[PDB]
Design a protein around this ligand. Structure first.
Ligand SMILES: *[C@@H]1O[C@H](CO)[C@@H](O[C@@H]2O[C@H](CO)[C@@H](O[C@@H]3O[C@H](CO)[C@@H](O)[C@H](O)[C@@H]3O)[C@H](O)[C@H]2NC(C)=O)[C@H](O)[C@H]1NC(C)=O
Ligand SMILES: *[C@@H]1O[C@H](CO)[C@@H](O[C@@H]2O[C@H](CO)[C@@H](O[C@@H]3O[C@H](CO)[C@@H](O)[C@H](O)[C@@H]3O)[C@H](O)[C@H]2NC(C)=O)[C@H](O)[C@H]1NC(C)=O
Ligand SMILES: *[C@@H]1O[C@H](CO[C@@H]2O[C@@H](C)[C@@H](O)[C@@H](O)[C@@H]2O)[C@@H](O)[C@H](O)[C@H]1NC(C)=O
Ligand SMILES: *[C@@H]1O[C@H](CO)[C@@H](O)[C@H](O)[C@H]1NC(C)=O
Ligand SMILES: *[C@@H]1O[C@H](CO)[C@@H](O)[C@H](O)[C@H]1NC(C)=O
Ligand SMILES: *[C@@H]1O[C@H](CO)[C@@H](O)[C@H](O)[C@H]1NC(C)=O
Ligand SMILES: OC[C@H]1O[C@@H](O)[C@H](O)[C@@H](O)[C@H]1O
Lengths: 391, 390
């Protein structure tokens, strides 16, 4: 989308994976979708270094709405759970130097069953702008017509544009197309800042794997369309929760960097380990994800339960990720000629290699003819940065 | 098996899951299957408090053997990887106050392709005893008939008894017949100290779930047969490795205690996190696993992606495990009437409840009228001990 936004992949926090549609503020007050949760999350984003690391957007997902629209046909926040409204929540979020994301649906209802935007695209977009919304995640439930789907996503794109407000437009367009036909990604890019391609992530290694496998299987269709202002969205970072081992967390962080993915954490910032925090706030890994060239990476190689991915970076630098997909035994050695990396450019005539994950370690100078030898933990990833050099 | 052994589930370390069949001592001398590897583990079992916690059996799995039997028709350890021989390794292990387990196969070859014991059961049994072996894991590969399988397991059982040496007998009997026939567990128990029921574990949460799910589905057939001298074997503890989250590791530790399972760690004792070590060495949790009553727990309830398992203990105590099987969202509230726990006797008229996992915390007195309220992490388990108040 040519709106001047998402020139690098968007970074922030989104409630969905970790908090979902918890409406029970009486028996689950700490977990329910309330203005208090978003306020408290905003406070920790500032005080715990998240904003400094680049996580700017505090995002509300589904289940913020009142059951019905008001007497004007405008959306309302739930009166019991958001008694002060979205306007004052946005004011609060902006005073902390952060931005506010919200959620709506192209069909007649949201996925959770709250008012949908069909028939209200212009009204809904304007009320978001009036409230001071900075990002919109637009879902695709309760829309069984292919025509309506495309018309809605296109309509809402222009509807937001006409407000004069700078709002990041996050679409689920391609994901809801697959049941009907293969998406036109050139068209989606024209209208969206980023787009969900695949099924919702959950708190599991199974889910990370299925997202990676879908991406690599479909990469010839999606890689080259990504770039400044328009990114593929493989869904939320789920590091800091419950279902991933340390190595599986490393794999997600490393690969979301390779993929030029928007980085939306879905976790609890009030209850997060020092280890998960350090990984999510890793300067060098975030710098890869945020590289100004904006070229999405890809799977270079697969075989023998190993995967090699690489991403071209600015200044003839490259990020290389090696995944060990064997889920038995111990660390396995993998060797590769550096000439095979970065299309033969990264290390011609030499490169300086620095391991970034699982730990940061300078590996030294590698001649074009030389071999890189490494060891990779089961379900883990080794992430390397290659710096082209004459030295 | 009435040999006076495995009166509580066997505890130790077994190389298989973590170290596999690595024969590359040239490129990987620190992780290949060798005498050195077992010496290093033996030292750490003593020095790092594993033996103190109850882990007594240091066990060799497959890939210790030379390609062929010696000139006398006996099994021999690989001459390069085990240069001093097994008898010498057992001498060393014993001097450390530990016990040595080894591995053989009922068929014509082991699963990795080394000499099988079919036709050599009496020689092999006597060889093991002579070496000072304290445990045998007896695999089921390359056995062409169910009759040969049953006969071999019975034969080796009797052959070990005739040596006069106390040797724990670990069988894979039921696992290898399950595809073809329902096992007779009364019969297996008569011959074995513990028995593998289900597919090999690996370093994954998928695997833990499969094992748990198989066990709860088959519990009517397997729970009551277990007891002192004969245990169901759901396979190795894989805590301390790479594929399990903290909460998934807690689930394995807690449920292996509920199941009265043998506790064979398969990990790298040289490279293990303090968190993993503390869990594996948890006194209170080990004590449940090791309860002298030896009554295997069972799944009590299943619904809304929650499972409740319980185990009767000595002196009118019970262990209760609550698993959260939903793999999305956050810590999830579960409640149950305490009157539904422990067959309605655990908390009549009252019980004191202590949470053991994920952390140790006294919950207090619960009347027979009470409800137990808990928040359980996705893929995690809450493990409790109930003491009847009298
Ligand atoms: C509503 O839609 C229009 C049309 O796409 C948007 O205007 C476009 O804005 C972008 C960026 O603001 C302009 O692209 C270029 O910006 C770079 C900045 O580095 C500059 O070097 C180039 O000279 C160029 O201006 C683009 O020209 C412009 N498109 C048109 C046809 O005017 C607009 O931003 C949308 N939303 C809003 C906030 O109104
Ligand atoms: C070979 O097999 C025989 C027979 O199955 C085993 O003998 C059994 O040994 C156990 C434990 O040593 C005996 O149980 C014990 O009985 C005494 C009663 O005097 C009691 O004080 C102990 O608490 C315990 O219950 C069991 O009775 C005995 N069975 C028979 C029928 O004699 C023998 O141990 C096996 N030998 C080896 C080396 O495995
Ligand atoms: C062990 O093997 C015996 C002989 O096996 C025969 O020769 C080998 C090379 C194969 O080709 C096989 O098909 C032949 O039967 C068997 O008599 C015996 O049953 C085997 N024992 C077990 C338990 O598998
Ligand atoms: C929403 O409902 C209207 C009227 O009931 C219907 O005509 C339309 O098909 C629905 N909209 C979408 C986009 O599914
Ligand atoms: C995809 O959509 C774009 C923009 O609407 C258009 O230029 C192109 O023809 C479409 N591609 C195909 C093959 O339909
Ligand atoms: C099971 O095995 C035991 C011991 O061999 C025997 O007493 C019993 O008859 C067997 N039962 C069945 C169902 O075959
Ligand atoms: O999307 C581009 C990529 O396409 C892959 O199929 C190919 O193996 C890579 O070399 C890379 O060029």
């Amino acid at each position: 989308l040519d709106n001047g936004l998402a020139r690098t992949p968007t970074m922030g926090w989104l409630h969905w994976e970790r908090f979902m549609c918890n409406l029970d503020c009486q028996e689950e007050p700490d977990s329910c979708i309330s203005e208090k949760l978003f306020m408290e999350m905003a406070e920790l984003m500032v005080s715990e270094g998240w904003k400094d690391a680049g996580y700017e957007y505090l995002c509300i997902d589904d289940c913020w709405m009142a059951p019905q629209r008001d007497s004007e046909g405008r959306l309302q926040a739930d009166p019991q759970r958001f008694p002060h409204g979205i306007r004052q929540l946005a004011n609060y979020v902006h005073s902390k130097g952060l931005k506010l994301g919200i959620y709506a649906d192209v069909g007649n209802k949201t996925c959770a069953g709250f008012p949908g935007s069909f028939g209200y695209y212009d009204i809904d977009a304007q009320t978001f702008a009036d409230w001071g919304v900075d990002l919109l995640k637009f879902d695709g439930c309760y829309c069984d017509s292919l025509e309506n789907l495309a018309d809605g996503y296109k309509h809402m794109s222009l509807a937001l544009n006409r407000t004069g407000r700078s709002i990041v437009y996050s679409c689920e367009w391609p994901l809801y197309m697959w049941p009907f036909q293969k998406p036109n990604y050139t068209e989606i890019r024209q209208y969206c800042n980023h787009w969900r391609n695949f099924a919702d992530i959950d708190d599991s290694w199974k889910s990370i794997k299925s997202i990676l496998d879908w991406t690599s299987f479909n990469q010839e269709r999606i890689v080259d369309v990504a770039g400044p202002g328009g990114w593929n969205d493989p869904d939320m970072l789920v590091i800091g929760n419950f279902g991933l081992s340390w190595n599986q967390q490393v794999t997600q962080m490393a690969l979301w960097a390779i993929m030029a993915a928007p980085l939306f954490m879905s976790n609890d910032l009030r209850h997060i380990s020092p280890q998960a925090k350090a990984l999510l706030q890793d300067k060098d890994v975030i710098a890869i994800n945020q590289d100004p060239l904006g070229k999405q990476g890809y799977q270079l190689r697969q075989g023998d339960n190993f995967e090699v991915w690489e991403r071209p970076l600015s200044g003839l630098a490259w990020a290389v990720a090696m995944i060990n997909r064997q889920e038995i035994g111990g660390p396995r050695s993998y060797t590769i000629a550096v000439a095979s990396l970065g299309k033969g450019v990264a290390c011609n005539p030499a490169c300086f290699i620095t391991q970034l994950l699982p730990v940061k370690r300078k590996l030294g100078f590698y001649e074009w003819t030389s071999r890189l030898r490494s060891h990779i933990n089961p379900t883990g990833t080794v992430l390397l940065q290659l710096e082209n050099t004459m030295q």
